[PDB]
């Protein structure tokens, strides 16, 4: 039978406009859709359906075989509710698998289908878009893994008992398998899981335990100039928003007088102590920070430049759950949008591994720029929420100061 | 009517069909409406009904242009606001630039198409209207629609859908033919020779006929260059049809605004169109009907525009086997002109972006924006991004982008030296300047009295303070920096606590909304080296 799925009280179906696609992408979607049409998974719809959800074609690791990807973010937020492993983060190596291919097996409630309406665009609009709706469980839709949960655990159990030292977690179309076995034995065991998964209907890795909490390193110098001290004080002052024990008084006293920026200032013992105490405070994360599951997770990113990027995940301003840095991947040398997308995906995978949810991003990129080119470098099955922001000059300056090896 | 499956139509959430009373008409209008309705009744378009229908829509009677023949119109205005929402019909029509050159083209007319597609037999009751009788007494003749009603909300969408089902087979059978649906028109073009082409068309027409959709008559046919909204489509290219400027020695505000409208649109195609002096006339206008005399300067540019508009600008069609190239020029601060072509001088399209009079930006940022706008435009027209030819050195780009706080990017491009070249007007020093004077600037203003002071004290003993009336604190802070700049040599170190100038350090803008910041920019540009240092206030 089909489970009667419905929308949250008062909500209506999504009517998100389809963004223009490149010719390659359109061709790929059309092929893919014709196939799914033949396989009875999706069906052409009429004008009596006013709903719509964005669709695009991605590519991931390993192929030319364009993968269809639908942006169900709005539908997910409108879908009724249906109401996590603490050890997954402490695993040596975690592998991700796309179990999205399993949903086509289960049919979607007929009365809900209308809401899955999506559209393949036409170049120069010389042809009306090709409208379709789902007949089965859609990939990327929250209701899919939920409905398919009964079946999912069932198929997974046999592997879980053969290997309960391994932790398996499911988020959307993904499955993260974390084990403490060494690379080879780990991967060999994963393929064992896949082979097991393949006798039903579907088809590198992370290292969580390595995610070290990096501190802030303050500059040290033989001689300090008026400007060096000034820059140090600016950053320390900002840092007092996190660590209220940080002090700039004794340093600020050295800044008394209209002296040349390049002039060298001898540090008074009192100022020297202050700097020492400050370094001690920054030696460890601020106390009392804990994750509240009933709160939205936030991820802010700053463009540090030269391929470097910094981020912080929190819920309350300054009470950071995690902070990190991302260097551009080989190849992304002239593309910011690629580095950013890669960053968002990396940060999001961590958020899932750690808290089992995707954070809401604050991206230092113009709406237009992002929306025009993010898809070209997207590889994950899911899509996180995002807002576009103006990065404050100091927040960047402070996190740039993070400790490196 | 036709033998096509009807579309399931429903009313909005919880509403009911219109129940508006029938407008009173004369024996004349009525007698007319009666005959038309008897005709439609037999064509199967409408059906005579009765009391088993509480819904009603006002029917009206009008005669057509410089003529006389009673027609009819039904005000579905109400039914429309009560009918469900449908899928959005193509609001964005194609653009000649993206049209592939077809050896033979043909445009069919299916005006009657609306009244050919059946209406959802369930929904029909809601389209009931009434032909009144002679002066509010004997009951009028009642009817309802059995076909897609003209003026009804869902008609255009439903008709388009139907046309698609019907065309799907033909399209598959012979893919070398390109069909385009637009209003009551089908623009069928192919690479076949005229004879084979005509044969296909007849097959197509006959195919539609089998479906109930009849096509044009020897009279109602579109033949010469297809006048497709402001464009004449020729086989070799497409031209811009006459955009005429009226000769009036009396111009009202309306006349001037409308004129500027036409002129502004012309700025996209025609090189050199200017309206500055025209716009100037709108200053302090007290009424649409006010007549403002054209200043000499206005009469001159209007004259120049008249000449520019009488030039043969023509575009070309799209050839997939050829590269898409877009070149940009900075036509003054903020304004950018571009032309997308495949083979030199043969443009597929041209255009220019007015200037977003921004709060705080720079040319490289603006160049980027123009680039992104063009890209989206290209992706929508050709499903491709073009190769860019930008008047900016790779070195300029690398230096700027690689250090901007915001993610920015420009697709595959190439430098084209066609002055003026966009550039970085200045670059703030990376470190303090050894030797150069150090200004400690400060401006403070009482936000309420709007009275303040802006000054500085340097390590060289130079000092100054200026009293300002009707200012704001931000203005003083900035002004402080201004004086610092004005009174300093070619190399300066400036320290301020204005984290609003900290914004200038990170973004280094070369244009702003405020005249003050602009002045500062002018000064910055003038120095050989400037080092801006921010320090926490108080
Ligand atoms: C409705 C819009 C979207 N156009 C359009 C829609 C659908 C298919 N194709 C289209 N176009 C392709 C580009 N294009 C030509 O290549 C062309 C014009 C043309 C004129 C004559 N002769 S004439 C009538 O006397 O001017 C002879 C051969 C010709 N070829 C015009 C038509």
Curated annotation (Swiss-Prot), chain B:
Result for mutant: residue 189 to S: Confers resistance to efavirenz and nevirapine
Result, substituting residue 137 to K: Confers resistance to emivirine
Effect of residue 214 to Y: Confers resistance to zidovudine
Effect of substituting residue 189 to A: Confers resistance to efavirenz and nevirapine
Reverse transcriptase domain segment(s): 43-233
Recorded consequence of changing residue 67 to N: Confers multi-NRTI resistance
Outcome reported for the amino acid change (mutating residue 235 to L): Confers resistance to atevirdine and delavirdine
Annotated site, Cleavage, chain positions: 439-440
Result for mutant: residue 187 to C: Confers resistance to nevirapine
Effect of residue 332 to E: Confers resistance to abacavir, lamivudine and zidovudine
Effect of residue 88 to K: Confers resistance to pyrophosphate analog PFA
Any coiled-coil regions, as ranges: none
Substitution effect: residue 187 to L: Confers resistance to efavirenz
Effect of substituting residue 189 to T: Confers resistance to efavirenz, HBY 097 and nevirapine
Binding-site residues, Mg(2+) 1: 109, 184-185
Outcome when changing residue 74 to I: Confers multi-NRTI resistance
Miscellaneous: Error-prone enzyme that lacks a proof-reading function. High mutations rate is a direct consequence of this characteristic. RT also displays frequent template switching leading to high recombination rate. Recombination mostly occurs between homologous regions of the two copackaged RNA genomes. If these two RNA molecules derive from different viral strains, reverse transcription will give rise to highly recombinated proviral DNAs.
Name recorded for this polypeptide: Reverse transcriptase/ribonuclease H
Organism listed in the record: Human immunodeficiency virus type 1 group M subtype B (isolate HXB2) (HIV-1)
